[PDB]
Ligand binder design. Structure first.
Ligand SMILES: CC(C)[C@H](Nc1ncnc2[nH]c(-c3cnc(N)nc3)cc12)c1ccc2c(c1)S(=O)(=O)CCC2
Length: 169
């Protein structure tokens, strides 16, 4: 079965959300596209990106280093399409702004705009966690920006509950 997402709550006609680890979702669903919460040099050193790379047994990091060698770093708000390895057909590496490192929160709209080149995506909540954006604001930017079908996996039940309550106000 293709893109067999299960147990998501539909927020709008094109945005769904689940309390889940994106890595476990990707292994089960094998979506057409999994989004990585990348940085501009595609160094998957921790957090979501480190977890996705570990699930590929470091194949994602080797492929990422070869992309950077030929093409140079991404821009904040930009993306590139690379292999999905065992997690998906493709991985869309998207760079959201890291507010904790002084990057402009307005670039979060540009970051989500990359999703619109793909019909169906499994994605994390961009710029949340240690990137420092307000996660309720990130969900609002996602809902207002993404027009294709996005399945958000948020690996924290406390945050999931706050996000759903924030949406349903
Ligand atoms: C807001 C968080 C709950 C959310 N976390 C997550 N959301 C979804 N699937 C996840 N798997 C893991 C995980 C981590 N480590 C191991 N070993 N396995 C899986 C984390 C996780 C999240 C959302 C976006 C960002 C981050 C974190 S970050 O990594 O701090 C910086 C980049 C942007």
């Amino acid at each position: 079965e293709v893109n067999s997402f299960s147990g998501y709550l539909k927020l709008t006609d094109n945005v769904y959300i689940k309390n889940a680890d994106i890595v476990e979702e990707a292994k089960k669903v094998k979506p057409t596209v999994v989004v990585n919460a990348a940085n501009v040099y595609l160094k998957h050193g921790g957090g979501v990106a480190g977890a996705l790379n570990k699930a590929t047994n470091n194949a994602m990091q080797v492929e990422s280093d070869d992309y950077i060698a030929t093409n140079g770093p991404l821009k904040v708000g930009g993306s590139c399409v690379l292999s999905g390895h065992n997690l998906a057909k493709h991985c869309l590496h998207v760079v959201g702004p890291n507010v904790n490192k002084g990057e402009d929160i307005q670039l979060l709209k540009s970051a989500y705009e990359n999703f619109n080149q793909h019909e169906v995506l499994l994605a994390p909540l961009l710029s949340a966690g240690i990137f420092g954006a307000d996660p309720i604001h990130s969900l609002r930017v996602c809902v207002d920006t993404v027009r294709t079908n996005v399945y958000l996996a948020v690996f924290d039940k406390n945050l999931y509950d706050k996000l759903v309550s924030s949406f349903l106000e």
